Paper text:
A truncated form of yNAGK spanning from residue 58 to 356, corresponding to the AAK domain and lacking the C-terminal DUF619 domain, was produced as a soluble protein in milligram amounts in E. coli. Four crystal structures of truncated yNAGK, ligand-free or complexed with either NAG or NAG and arginine, were determined using for the initial phasing single anomalous diffraction (SAD) from a Se-Met derivative. In the crystals containing NAG, one NAG molecule was found in each subunit. As reported in other NAGKs (best studied in EcNAGK), NAG is bound in a pocket in the N-lobe under the closed lid formed by the β3–β4 hairpin. In yNAGK, the β5 strands of the two subunits still interact with each other, although they are parallel due to the large rotation of one subunit relative to the other. In any case, the interactions mediated by these stands result in the association of two yNAGK dimers into a relatively flat rectangular tetramer with approximate dimensions of 35 Å×109 Å×83 Å. Two active centers, separated by a distance of 80 Å, are exposed in one diagonal on each face of the tetramer.
The first step of the route is the production of N-acetyl-L-glutamate (NAG), while the second is the phosphorylation of NAG by [name] (NAGK). We report here structural and functional studies on the arginine-sensitive NAGK from [name] (yNAGK). The structure of the mature yNAGK, lacking the N-terminal [name] targeting sequence (residues 1–57), reveals an unexpected novel tetrameric architecture, which can be described as a dimer of dimers with D2 symmetry. The AAK domains occupy the center of the molecule flanked by two pairs of interacting DUF619 domains.
Residue numbers in the entry:
A (entry chain A), D (entry chain C): 62 to 352
B (entry chain B): 63 to 351
C (entry chain D): 63 to 352
């Protein structure tokens, strides 16, 4: 809601504008009376460890121009770092972490740390943020025998996210879910973000990763656009598509079958976020249902 | 940058009238150490019955640059919800027996009450941070007897300190978690006692509706309890039951660990300002004898 | 401290449409040096006739973190006051002949107009600092001919720089003072020119009601004057008289000192933003020429 | 008008408070609704060169609690230092500087310097201050033959001072006056401050000096109170009341003849001002009508 452009906000806004067209684009967003949620942004765990300042800076820009994102982040790399320090190797199937009781302890502790890290970086920039670490995702077991403490999300409770935004604070969420009776269950961040998007139907849906999209492994070329109805089935049969990419793309396809056809998902690097959000950039991989 | 209005400064002056009161305030106003001003436990009933006065008093503390650690309960509204759905509340030794359905009600109630308090504060211009999990680590108190109830074994200070450092009042629930991530129900008086133990605040305050503890055998409010002299005999009295017994027990165990200079005030919210700014306690004061 | 509202940012965006314009704004927005963005001379009449527009335009500049040096006149208010007293205004070569009584009137009017503008700015949330003396030191221009009229010999920058450093728009009169403290009257166009000479600002703007200079022999507004080619011929034209003649000469002598990249814009307040943010001038532009 | 207590303002207020009586004294000023000007404060020129931080700091306290003083400063000592360096002996009669053309140029320069020094120190503390160096005092020649460029003040134009206060800025004045036709005339700062106090009829009238009051030259002791109706005539016959002190005492006597008997004037060091204004300390020299 609250628009308050600091010196850094003004510089961020102007520094890459070069045309009337770009100016007009920003004017359209700043004069908008829409009540639609602006954005759900999924943040790769690696970005919080490697690229915190940059992440905090673009989130701060959005905050200062009154366009609050719902932010959901992962924690995969730092979990593997802790397990390795303890002489334990991680285990996945279908891109999903097999999560026994000891692994869940590490996952929970790492999520809390990395969540607070991001919230604090934001507060150090004068951006109000709330760590939302429980009470959003209710889940049952995806498959206890196979994955152990891994959740299948059944419902999203919106009130803590909306209360945060209403209070003027960015809601910063982990992908942890809970059963009704309170057993925490690990969920993949790509999946949890998609559930948020499903229920909020935001203007913008963004997945931030380091590669800045999805890279065709046979050619090495970045895939600019994916038309799911045409390309999904045979894209998934390609042997270069890694488990994590397969999980990501499956979730997005399911998400976009629910959302209206006007919705889309951008998979992009954080340095290209502003131009993709505001000035209609072709950076990253854009994914839509299509025909 | 901190600033205070005329009304805030006037109310501040109205609370301070001696050199030691001034010094106490300024000591905590400009945080020169990791020392904490207050742990304030809020009875759940206050959030449903007297929220505006609770929020206003906490908002005054914030506006004079003080950041109490606030932890609230939710027992009465859990009891309300259960009775509303035709389920009778289930306690033993003052502790709620918490099966799988009861825990879902407790969690949802905790979160609702928490957001209610946080939002009332925000509406008064107070930055408040919900801290609903991640502080209390527990194992099962007694599975067979209480089911999903915790016995706290550690307090993680970071989220509370981070909140204060960001200039927001931390508003905590008493939910705890096992290492493996099973949330457990903990009595809010007990949890508050665990916070006081690790933070060693200047002030330890429990807010209830009665404004202290009443002696059942006489019908008179108890002004002071000297534990070393009175605890053993007091716990034998048959009028001392349920939640009260549990409250006195935890406070006794807390004050055994804290220095003799510490004390615990059980008061009504209308006595909070006087209890925090002066040594002339109100309600029921408890100290080591 | 700095923050900008939505409507401030919207208005900034409406003023910028090229990369060059962005880099120009950013250069002056982020400056930690003594470089100056603008000297803006305000015609006295505008304070009587169109104050709110003037004050709003200056407020926008302040709200985007730009700190123009503002110097204003008061000629027409003085003439009205003299005529209210049954005194005929007395000019030669565009300069007011200023005896003791007239100096009292000029001083009072100047201080009044100054406080009028400063207060209008403050009402819009703009910090503005009256600077009514201590800037211009002067000798007598010609005591027999003009009486209490000054020829400016130095400009003290300190009061203006301190205002800007504190985040306040400096609002100046053109009153000057002898070393020993006799105030001397100076034409506001000339004093503004002296300010431009020592500050060498990016932008030199003269605000008048006509939005430039009209060629008397055609009735057409002059869009551009290239002084090297046109100045001698122009000053021989019979329609070039009084205050307009003085203004042109003063601008010419100013531009003899400044680099060829400089220019002076004589415009109406409605064109101030365009003139400040873009290279597409308005009204009457004056330069040396290439 | 605008009350806004900063961190340092709160500490400044409470630091010295030990009793309920002191508290109630501050409550009286903070709950007040009277339209009367709070204070006229004369600042000896030396304080601006010698103890500027401390001066800026107590003025800042008054600003932040919404009790704006009208501030008038001198510059006598630094003019003498300038003259000294040019090989010129300072020239005084009856505590008033004889001021020829050269000396007026020094006085003027050096007034503007001290004025801007004070204004800038206030602004650095986040206090809005407006330099008011002309347009307040209109004067005739005091005695051209005897004093040269020295003024006798005939009127005080209030508008600039009231406009500054209304805008939220402390008005910081020099004592320079001007004739109708614009010859600047030098006026002693003690006299100009008296002329301000006459027309503003403030609640408090304070003269700040480094000595911290007036010293009885014969006994070698600070004078705490002067009852003028009783003491004035004999005081003016004492050998140790000459130069500025004589001028000051006479100007204060004439001021308190015009003002009601409830008014008084304090002469004090800046370190004792807060306690003097708010909690009736009895430091420095208090002067009043008496009987
Ligand atoms: C179930 C599962 O795979 N959880 C992910 C969540 C963290 C993330 O996505 O970065 C994990 O790595 O444990
Ligand atoms: C274990 C237990 O009794 N917990 C409390 C928590 C709420 C409170 O203390 O207000 C309960 O009523 O469930
Ligand atoms: C000397 C001289 O002509 N001064 C001008 C100054 C006012 C103005 O320029 O608006 C005058 O009118 O007296
Ligand atoms: C006339 C006169 O004596 N003026 C004083 C003004 C400065 C002051 O009072 O400090 C002077 O010393 O010149
Ligand atoms: Cl960005
Ligand atoms: Cl860990
Ligand atoms: Cl209240
Ligand atoms: Cl419920
Ligand atoms: Cl509920
Ligand atoms: Cl306008
Ligand atoms: Cl000097
Ligand atoms: Hg960890
Ligand atoms: Hg509930
Ligand atoms: Hg309180
Ligand atoms: Hg305008
Ligand atoms: Hg006039
Ligand atoms: Hg000097
Ligand atoms: Hg003071």
């Amino acid at each position: 809601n609250g628009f308050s452009a600091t010196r850094s906000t003004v510089i961020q806004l102007l520094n890459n504008i070069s045309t009337k067209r770009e100016v007009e684009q920003y004017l359209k967003y700043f004069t908008s009376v829409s009540q639609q949620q602006f954005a759900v942004i999924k943040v790769g765990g690696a970005i919080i460890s490697d690229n915190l300042h940059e992440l905090a800076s673009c989130l701060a820009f959005l905050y200062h121009v009154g366009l609050y994102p719902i932010v959901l982040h992962g924690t995969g790399p730092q979990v593997n770092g802790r397990l390795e320090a303890q002489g334990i190797e991680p285990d996945y199937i279908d891109g999903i972490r097999i999560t026994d009781e000891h692994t869940m302890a590490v996952v929970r502790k790492c999520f809390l740390e990395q969540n607070l890290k991001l919230v604090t970086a934001l507060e150090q920039l004068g951006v109000r943020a709330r760590p939302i670490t429980s009470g959003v995702f209710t889940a049952d077991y995806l498959d206890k025998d196979k994955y152990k403490l891994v959740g299948n999300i059944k419902s999203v409770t919106k009130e803590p996210i909306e209360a945060s935004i209403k209070a003027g604070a960015l809601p910063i969420l982990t992908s942890l879910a809970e059963t009704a009776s309170g057993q925490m269950l690990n969920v993949n961040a790509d999946v949890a973000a998609g559930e948020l998007a499903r229920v909020f139907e935001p203007l913008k849906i963004v997945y931030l990763n380091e590669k800045g999209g999805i890279i065709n492994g046979s050619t090495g070329e970045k895939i600019s656009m994916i038309n799911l109805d045409e390309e999904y089935d045979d894209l998934m049969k390609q042997s270069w598509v890694k488990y994590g990419t397969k999980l990501k793309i499956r979730e997005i396809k399911e998400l976009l079958d629910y959302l209206p056809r006007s919705s889309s998902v951008a998979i992009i690097n954080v340095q290209d976020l502003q131009k993709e959000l505001f000035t209609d950039s072709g950076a990253g991989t854009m994914i839509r249902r299509g025909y």
